[PDB]
Symmetry: C2
Subunit: 255 residues, 2 copies
């Protein structure tokens, strides 16, 4: 009797969302989105049953000063989940404590800002002070700036952290609202930017990607599923299914 | 002990260093992958001996299912590591353990500048301009199996007339582009390398799929995860990007 895998995930549009329904929904049927479609495709290739559970603390995964982890990462470390199927960024510190699959998405930091401005790059942002710019506090983008030894990015981190980190935002949602309302440019993961620009015709991605990273399925260290999940991901990649899935959930109504 | 690294001669990843005197050992070679190997060695603290794969192949299966190239060196435990632009594919990942990718890339089009061709679709709608790919390589496999209508049509063209539109390898493909009316579909890293050095040529459109290059290790290697963690370190330090710019920089 094959065991049902527990899948930890997080509410995050368009990866995982409650489905709209005129009757109560139960189990996996409660949810829809990119990561649900991904799960269905993985399950079809590998032949496993699964149980989607929202991570209780609603976090991706970071460690405090005591080395203790939270979020989906912690669920995996503690073996309360078999897989984390979510847009979990593959980072050095996370890869040390869990086994990531190969990336099902590749992306990077870029800029979300208004159209029709003199800004065309990170360097354009860096050499001025009138247009405020920043990032989500304590996220992947912030870490990149905090740790970069590139002159242009060091100067941007200095600006970002000045005035008691006023230029930083709490999370991606508040950042996007800030762009929409005030004169503010948001540095963030490009996936998030694409989703927004598809839906907000007055905003745009500026410059290219300034680094590179992927999203991977998380599994516990020593997981017997990680290598199989990787091979399934590569199969979906080569057959063009990941690309199709991304387009399905990202594409807006046109601008 | 010293790790044996299998690799392959391929510009600008691995090249014989130019010298007025004989060179020996690792000092014989230079390129992006040697720079990568240096950085990995610095982080993980291993010594290494670089050895060109005898058959000068990346890794594919013959009709009897036998593997060749760097992949085979790994399967047979004749090398600890493959540090080369080894494309992470479904069939290869089944028989060796790949690191996370140190480069991400995709299929694109190499062609002459200034033409009305702007996408694969523009090629597929016509037959005057020949187009194809390297026979039996990664690009071909994508077309061979795609169920996108436009790519299905292109594969039928490529495979027609005794595969006249296919080429033996990337180098001959590139020559075919420079001398005749021919568009080559291939890995974008190769296209970027060429177009930095030949202002006659350009990339058409964007990437029509996605894939990475990974360090290869034999299945079960304890180095795979350590190498992956080192790659993520270099990625986050911005070092991989730096190394790419160094070796690719050379047109309007
Ligand atoms: C909307 C997608 C959330 C993304 C999905 N991947 C990131 C993660 O795995 O932690 C989330 C994250 C958290 C906080 C800040 C950023 C950022 O872009 O600078 C990203
Ligand atoms: C110049 C670098 C050779 C690349 C490096 N990565 C590929 C590999 O690992 O097999 C090589 C390869 C072999 C045959 C055809 C193609 C293609 O682009 O369609 C690529
Ligand atoms: Cl739940
Ligand atoms: Cl991996
Ligand atoms: Cl040699
Ligand atoms: Cl091959």
């Amino acid at each position: 009797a094959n065991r049902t895998l527990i899948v930890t995930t997080i509410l995050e549009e368009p990866y995982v969302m409650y489905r709209k329904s005129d009757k109560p929904l139960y189990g996996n049927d409660r949810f829809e989105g990119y990561c649900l479609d991904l799960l269905k495709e993985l399950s079809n290739i590998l032949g496993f049953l699964y149980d989607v559970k929202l991570v209780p603390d609603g976090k991706y995964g970071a460690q405090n000063d005591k080395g203790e982890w939270n979020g989906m990462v912690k669920e995996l470390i503690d073996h309360r989940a078999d897989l984390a199927v979510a847009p979990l960024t593959i980072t050095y510190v996370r890869e040390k404590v869990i086994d990531f699959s190969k990336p099902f998405m590749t992306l990077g930091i870029s800029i979300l800002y208004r159209k029709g401005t003199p800004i065309d790059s990170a360097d354009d942002l860096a050499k001025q002070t009138k247009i405020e710019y920043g990032a989500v506090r304590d996220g992947s983008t912030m870490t990149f700036f905090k740790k970069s030894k590139i002159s242009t990015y060091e100067k941007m981190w200095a600006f970002m952290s000045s005035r008691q980190q006023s230029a930083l935002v709490k999370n991606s949602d508040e950042g996007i609202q800030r762009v929409l309302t005030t004169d503010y440019a948001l540095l963030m993961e490009s996936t998030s930017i694409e989703y927004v620009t598809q839906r907000n015709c007055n905003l745009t991605q500026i410059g290219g990607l300034i680094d590179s990273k992927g999203y991977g399925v998380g599994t516990p260290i020593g997981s017997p599923y990680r290598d199989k999940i990787t091979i399934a991901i590569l199969q979906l990649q080569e057959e063009g299914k990941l690309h199709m899935m991304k387009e399905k959930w990202w594409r807006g109504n046109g601008c």
